[PDB]
DNA sequence: GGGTGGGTGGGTGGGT
DNA sequence: GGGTGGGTGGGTGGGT
DNA sequence: GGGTGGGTGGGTGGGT
DNA sequence: GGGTGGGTGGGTGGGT
């Protein structure tokens, strides 16, 4: 996942997709 | 709490302690 | 429930929808 | 952990120790 | 669970 | 959380 | 695995 | 990682 995600956003960013 | 105990009996058992 | 409710509000929040 | 845990008794037996 | 049970009982207890 | 809040609201929601 | 489980639990645990 | 996140999400994902 891409690197300057943090939290929730790197979990979400797999939920969406 | 003992299970023969029912609808206030419930409640009140905590009650009493 | 929003930050903001208190009190009654609170379930009422949840009572309204 | 013990084969026959399941369900949250498998994640219990490891929070236990 | 409901709002006529109350809100200084609390909000990860549930309303989802 | 308390027991003048009620018990067909429930007991896996929690309880000096 | 899912996103109402949460994000000070972590991203080398995975997102088949 | 924690157990107040849930257990039909899984246990070869990890576990002071
Ligand atoms: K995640
Ligand atoms: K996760
Ligand atoms: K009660
Ligand atoms: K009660
Ligand atoms: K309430
Ligand atoms: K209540
Ligand atoms: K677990
Ligand atoms: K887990
Ligand atoms: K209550
Ligand atoms: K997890």
Do not use: Q, S, T
Not at 7 to 17: D, F, H, N, T, V
Request: aromatic share 12%; charged share 30%.
């Amino acid at each position: 996942h891409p690197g300057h995600l943090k939290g929730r956003e790197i979990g979400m960013w797999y939920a969406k997709k």
